[PDB]
C-alpha cells in the first residue's frame, strides 16, 4: 500500500471544548468560543491515544458530553445519574481512552477501539439529551487503527430527525471532490426515525472501515444502508471511480424523506473543474 496510513497511537492529547447556545436557538459544540458548529468539530485519534477534554458549558442549562465506543470511566459518563454533567457556566475535564486489539490472559481476543463513533449531549431537554441532540449537540469521533488508509478529506453527514446536519430540507449539504479523490464520509443518525442512506454511482463495504481487506473479505458491498438513532458508520470511496464526474446525489431512500428534501449533492468534478451538464 502506497497510500497514507494511520500511525500507531499512544499519545496523550488535550482538547478544549465548549457548549454554546447559537443565535438561531440551536446549541452546538466548538473548540473556540464563538466558533461552535452543528455538527460539532471532528475528533480524530489513533488506537491507544488518551484524550483529555476540558469541557466548558457556556449555556444557561445543564449540558454534558457522552461518547460512543471509546473507553471512559463512570466519571466521564456525561449523565445526570452519575453526577457527570456540567452545571451552567461550569467546566469539567472528561477523559476518553482508546486501546489496541490484543490477546487477553484467557486467550480470547479483545477488540480495539477503532471505528466511526460519535459524541452528543445527554442531559439537555431530558435525561437522555433529547433536547440537546435535537438542538445540534452532536459530533463525530474517528478512532483509527494502525495501518488504516487515510483519506484526502472527511465529510460528516448527520441524519437528525428530518434534517441533514440540522439544515433546512432541500438545502443539502453539498460537498465537492475531483475524480480520483479518496473521500471519507462519517454518517451519524439521531432522533426518532429510521433512515436508509443511499448514494448514487458509489458503493462501499458494510464493515468497520467501508473498505475490503482484500479478496478474502466477506463483507457485503452496498450503496444503501439502513440506520437508526445513535447509529454511526463511515466509509471511504474513490470519487467517480468507474462512473466519472457528475452531480452524484445522495439521499435517504425512505420515499417521502427524499421527497421532503433529505437530499444532497456529491459534486465530483473533472480535472478541469467542471461537472457534466453544467
Question: Which residues 251-270 are close enough to bind Cu ion by CB under 5 A?
Answer: 252, 254, 257
Contact string 172-191 vs a second copy (x = CB under 8 A): ------------------xx
Does 68 show up as a binding residue in the annotation? yes
Give the C-alpha distances (Å, rounded to integers) separating 163 from 151, 157, 160, 180, 209: 26, 10, 5, 29, 25
232 binds a second copy (CB under 8 A): yes
Is 190 annotated to bind ligand? no
Smallest distance, Å, CB 137 to ligand [O-]?
A: 12
Taking the complex as a whole, the smallest distance from the CB of residue 72 to ligand [O-] amounts, in Å, to 12
Residue 99 is assigned to a ligand binding site:
no
Cα separation, 21 vs 28, in Å, equals 7
CB closer to ligand [O-] out of 149 and 243: 243
Q: How many CB atoms lie within 10 A of CB 214?
A: 6
Q: Which is nearer to ligand [O-], 120 or 144 (CB)?
A: 120
Q: Which residues bind ligand [O-] (CB under 6 A)?
A: 66, 122, 198, 253
- Positive/negative CA dihedral, 224, 228, 233, 238: positive
| Helix and strand counts by DSSP (H, E) for the chain | 2, 21
Q: Which residues contact 142 (CB under 8 A, 6 or more apart)?
A: 42, 43, 44, 45, 116, 117, 154, 186, 234
155 is in an annotated binding site: no
Answer yes or no whether residue 22 interacts with a second copy by CB under 8 A. no
CA 191, 29, 54, 45: dihedral to nearest 10 degrees?
A: 80
Binding site per annotation, positions: 66, 68, 120, 122, 195, 198, 200, 251-253, 257
Binding site per annotation, positions for Cu(2+): 66, 68, 120, 122, 195, 198, 200, 251-253, 257
Amino acid at each position: 500500500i502506497t497510500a497514507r496510513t494511520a500511525p500507531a497511537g499512544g499519545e496523550v492529547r488535550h482538547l478544549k471544548m465548549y457548549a454554546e447556545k447559537l443565535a438561531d436557538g440551536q446549541m452546538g459544540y466548538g473548540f473556540e468560543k464563538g466558533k461552535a458548529s452543528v455538527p460539532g468539530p471532528l475528533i480524530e485519534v489513533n488506537e491507544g491515544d488518551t484524550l483529555h477534554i476540558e469541557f466548558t458549558n457556556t449555556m444557561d442549562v445543564r449540558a454534558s458530553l457522552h461518547v460512543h465506543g471509546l473507553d471512559y470511566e463512570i466519571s466521564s459518563d456525561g449523565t445526570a445519574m452519575n453526577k457527570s454533567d456540567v452545571e451552567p457556566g461550569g467546566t469539567r475535564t472528561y477523559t476518553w481512552r482508546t486501546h489496541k486489539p490484543g490477546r487477553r490472559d484467557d486467550g480470547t481476543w479483545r477488540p480495539g477501539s477503532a471505528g466511526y463513533w460519535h459524541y452528543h449531549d445527554h442531559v439537555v431537554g431530558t435525561e437522555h439529551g433529547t433536547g440537546g441532540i435535537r438542538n445540534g449537540l452532536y459530533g463525530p469521533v474517528i478512532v483509527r487503527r494502525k495501518g488504516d488508509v487515510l483519506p484526502d478529506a472527511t465529510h460528516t453527514i448527520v441524519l437528525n430527525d428530518m434534517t441533514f446536519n440540522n439544515r433546512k430540507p432541500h438545502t443539502g449539504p453539498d460537498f465537492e471532490a475531483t475524480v480520483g479523490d479518496r473521500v471519507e464520509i462519517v454518517m451519524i443518525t439521531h432522533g426518532e426515525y429510521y433512515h436508509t442512506f443511499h448514494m448514487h454511482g458509489h458503493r462501499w463495504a458494510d464493515n468497520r472501515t467501508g473498505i475490503l481487506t482484500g479478496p478474502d473479505d466477506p463483507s457485503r458491498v452496498i450503496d444503501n444502508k439502513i440506520t437508526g438513532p445513535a447509529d454511526s458508520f463511515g466509509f471511504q470511496i474513490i470519487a467517480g471511480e468507474g462512473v466519472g464526474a457528475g452531480a452524484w446525489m445522495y439521499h435517504c431512500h425512505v420515499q417521502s424523506h427524499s421527497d421532503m428534501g433529505l437530499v444532497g449533492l456529491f459534486l465530483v468534478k473533472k480535472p478541469d473543474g467542471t461537472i457534466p451538464g453544467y
